Design an enzyme around this catalytic site. Sequence first.
Site, PDB file in Angstrom:
ATOM      1  N   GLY A  61      -5.851 -17.200  -7.074  1.00 39.90           N
ATOM      2  CA  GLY A  61      -6.549 -17.583  -5.861  1.00 39.90           C
ATOM      3  C   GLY A  61      -8.046 -17.706  -6.057  1.00 39.90           C
ATOM      4  N   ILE A 105     -10.098  -9.559  -3.870  1.00 44.61           N
ATOM      5  CA  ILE A 105      -9.043 -10.256  -4.582  1.00 44.61           C
ATOM      6  C   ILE A 105      -8.496 -11.327  -3.646  1.00 44.61           C
ATOM      7  CG2 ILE A 105      -6.879 -10.010  -5.853  1.00 44.61           C
ATOM      8  CD1 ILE A 105      -8.960  -6.970  -5.153  1.00 44.61           C
ATOM      9  N   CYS A 106      -7.827 -12.327  -4.216  1.00 44.86           N
ATOM     10  CA  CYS A 106      -7.179 -13.389  -3.448  1.00 44.86           C
ATOM     11  C   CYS A 106      -5.766 -13.646  -3.965  1.00 44.86           C
ATOM     12  CB  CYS A 106      -8.012 -14.666  -3.476  1.00 44.86           C
ATOM     13  SG  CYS A 106      -9.371 -14.670  -2.291  1.00 44.86           S
ATOM     14  N   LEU A 107      -4.963 -12.594  -4.082  1.00 44.25           N
ATOM     15  CA  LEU A 107      -3.559 -12.781  -4.419  1.00 44.25           C
ATOM     16  C   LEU A 107      -2.832 -13.470  -3.274  1.00 44.25           C
ATOM     17  CD1 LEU A 107      -2.455  -9.506  -6.229  1.00 44.25           C
ATOM     18  CD2 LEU A 107      -4.011 -11.330  -6.943  1.00 44.25           C
ATOM     19  N   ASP A 108      -1.867 -14.320  -3.617  1.00 44.71           N
ATOM     20  CA  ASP A 108      -1.019 -14.895  -2.584  1.00 44.71           C
ATOM     21  C   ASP A 108      -0.088 -13.851  -1.983  1.00 44.71           C
ATOM     22  OD1 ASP A 108       0.883 -14.455  -4.530  1.00 44.71           O
ATOM     23  OD2 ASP A 108       1.337 -16.565  -4.873  1.00 44.71           O
TER      24      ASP A 108
END
Lengths: 76, 76, 365, 146
Positions: free
Chosen positions: B76, D83-86
């Site tokens: 992401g 964070i940018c986890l799906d």
Amino acid sequence: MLIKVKTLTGKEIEIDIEPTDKVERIKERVEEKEGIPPQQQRLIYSGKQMNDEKTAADYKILGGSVLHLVLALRGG
Amino acid sequence: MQIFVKTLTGKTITLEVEPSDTIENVKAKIQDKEGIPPDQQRLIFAGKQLEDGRTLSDYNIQKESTLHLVLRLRGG
Amino acid sequence: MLGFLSARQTGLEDPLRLRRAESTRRVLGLELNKDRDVERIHGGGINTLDIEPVEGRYMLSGGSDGVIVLYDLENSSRQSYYTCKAVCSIGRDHPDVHRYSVETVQWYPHDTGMFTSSSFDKTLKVWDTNTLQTADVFNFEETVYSHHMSPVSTKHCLVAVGTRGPKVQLCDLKSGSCSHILQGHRQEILAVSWSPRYDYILATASADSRVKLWDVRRASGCLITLDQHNGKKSQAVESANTAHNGKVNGLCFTSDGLHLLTVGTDNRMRLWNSSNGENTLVNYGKVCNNSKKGLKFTVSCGCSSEFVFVPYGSTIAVYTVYSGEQITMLKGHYKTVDCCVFQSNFQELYSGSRDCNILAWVPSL
Amino acid sequence: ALKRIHKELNDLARDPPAQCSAGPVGDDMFHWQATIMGPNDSPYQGGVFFLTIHFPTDYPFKPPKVAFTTRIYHPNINSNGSICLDILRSQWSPALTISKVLLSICSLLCDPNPDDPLVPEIARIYKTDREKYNRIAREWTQKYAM
């Protein structure tokens, strides 16, 4: 009480300590059963890097409370 | 030989595998063990994706080891 | 500065002179500190802060997620660098935690044992500092942007509570009676404040661009209705006497209590006289704000020239109250700043933002 | 719910994950602090990166807001430590527990995706030259993790 100091590899080193031992004592006990002198440990208990002057009772360490050991190769 | 894997539901199951075996068959064994599709697994050993087109011997996996199962994610 | 020391030593200048000059010097050199930290505990933003009045030791903070941390600003360690560890906390696991954002936490004046808070759950709870248990809870019919207790009243213990209804609520922390209301506003009441000097003078800011001072003893309206042009554009009080052009969402009496600083969404401050509501025409330039709730800001104490620390976008602006000059612009945050509180004892400033941080600014050298 | 967090805490204390460790910071059980030891055979070797978990009031059915506290070099993790986890925003699943989200983050420390990156400035370096990436990440680890 027993603290089992499990490292990265999954080896689960057993340790014994009285409820009031200073964490330097914990590192020293790890030295005897594992061989890494206290300068090169960084014990991490439940997401808090233990500080070398706090007493074990500070962190609420109980029987069978697993720590984590991580090597600091420099270690002064 | 066999190997331990920690499924998502808290349980733990033991897989009978050989080092020559590829990860795709490992995921298929996870499937017919509990049934989450080959695509959705993401096996973790020492914080590493277990690549589908590889075998356990590639990742330095031995007896009584442990593999961690999670849900498929992305960047992401 | 050795000159001041010698002058104080030989009795030339009063010790007051060195004290105030040094405090002003320290505030002028204010800067962010990496030699100090405040532990991150709020999930969302920080909406409010209130250092305790006496001894300046503890420090509350109303997180936007309903958690009321209670810091401890004393460097109990031995190193130069330290972090203000959070002593207690009204976590979400607490049975009586605030369900929504906590936007004002204030210590019970003259008694650090208790402190109060209020949230969009339409509740104002009286917290006990020791056991962390709600002593009294008042439930309102509508939200509570901001509330304030008299820092001077030893007689009453009323609590102005500005709900998003048009009616100011007065809650009594003694035998409970929220019956007393002050009618006269027309829209939501975004910021109230008791007079630090007089016991019963309450200044309430609203979203219809009106700032009114209420003598709560009087039960027939307000003493004054602030007007921008000091009556130059005279018009009867039905749609006139507007202290701003947009919402006015912040009040702060000066430390002496002689002047009522107001900041509103029209992007201006105005230093109004607190006895007759006559704007003193201090310019202050253009101050940027766009918040839609109570904007907190404080004014220095024990300095030669009184400073005001207003949240300015994502930065703290430091203006001189009685001249309007812009001293500087403290710049260390990552989102809009919601509340800055001045530590009068040591000239330190703690500024909670919307990025979950509480940056403690301290003087240099 | 608390009871879910209580059960997670107990089953983590009993059978901890290998290179992970998380426990409440104080009285409030909804605010954990975790710790991701850098996975072996990676630029993050020997590192100890501290997270900061925040469980919502409906934790089983709504993700926890985890955010790095130790400034980590990563295309998928901004300098603010977010964070940018799906899995953590869109595809959160109750079956996934904190011992699992931490391990997944540990795995992703070595498996970034510069496509759709949270930090394009580092993503370009990663996509173009991976040799320099393994040195800049190494120095950041040495200057923050150790």
